[PDB]
Amino acid sequence: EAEAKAKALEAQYRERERAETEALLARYRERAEAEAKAVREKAMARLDEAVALVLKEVLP
C-alpha cells in the first residue's frame, strides 16, 4: 500500500505539475503579446507631437 500510493501520488501529481505549469504559462505568453501590442498602439499615434518641443529646446 505504501509503494502503490507513493507511485500514484508521484506520477499523477507530476503530470498535474506539468499541466498546471503549462496552462498558466501559456496565458503569460498571451499577456506578453497583449502588453507589447498595447504599448505599440499607445506609441504609434503620439509621435512627432513632442519632437518639435525637443527641437525647440536643442536649437538655441
Binding site: 505539475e17 505549469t21 504559462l25
Partner: protein
C-alpha cells in the same frame, strides 16, 4: 492423574499466555505500522505538494 494434570493445566496456561502474546504482538505490529502508514502517507503527500506549490510560485513569478 491429579498433580501432573495440574502441571499440564499450567502447560495449557502457558498456551494461554502464548496466545495472549500472539494476539498482543499482532495488534502491536498492526498499530505501529498503521501509524507509520498514515505518517508516510502524509509525509510524501505534503513533501511533493510543497514542491509542486513552490514550482507554481516560481513559475508564475518568472
Amino acid at each position: 492423574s491429579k498433580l501432573e494434570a495440574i502441571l499440564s493445566q499450567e502447560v495449557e496456561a502457558e498456551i494461554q499466555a502464548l496466545l495472549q502474546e500472539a494476539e498482543a504482538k499482532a495488534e502491536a505490529v498492526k498499530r505501529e505500522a498503521e501509524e507509520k502508514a498514515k505518517a508516510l502517507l502524509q509525509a510524501r503527500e505534503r513533501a511533493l505538494e510543497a514542491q509542486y506549490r513552490a514550482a507554481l510560485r516560481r513559475a508564475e513569478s518568472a
